Amino acid sequence: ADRMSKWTSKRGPRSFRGRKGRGAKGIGFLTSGWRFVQIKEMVPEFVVPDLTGFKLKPYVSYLAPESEETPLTAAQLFSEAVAPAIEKDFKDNLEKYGFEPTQEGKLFQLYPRNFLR
């Protein structure tokens, strides 16, 4: 009889309560006998770096110069990454300079994005 309360797995008969989740991404599948097969590749692997020797504390000293915000753009990235090599080889096949015709064949395809975060 309650319509304004959110629909959660805590409401409904046993089948409903079992079937609905809470947003947790699936980790595997179910086989005969309701046995859960967990796939390792489906478990997110936290790629935590080595923080030893890292010099960047969470906060920044207040005695730090203030600089104008310059959001990175495609043009800026091209100028700072590709333009030098392009100029050199023009003075002296874009794959050599860096362009990749197709995202297929890459582990990290930019579009459609296939990596987390």
């Binding site: 409401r11 409904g12 008969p13």
Partner: protein, 45 residues
């Protein structure tokens, strides 16, 4: 003797007044549209 005609059961609730059932037929689609036009906070049940 009367008064307790509502014997709650979420299965019947959702199978009778649910979003899927309302969208199943054009009449229910228009019901949802009427609720949306009126501004109801609860379009379906």
């Amino acid at each position: 003797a009367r008064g307790n005609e509502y014997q709650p059961s979420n299965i019947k609730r959702k199978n009778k007044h649910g979003w899927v059932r309302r969208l199943s037929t054009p009449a229910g689609v228009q019901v949802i549209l009427r609720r949306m036009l009126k501004g109801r906070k609860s379009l379906s049940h």
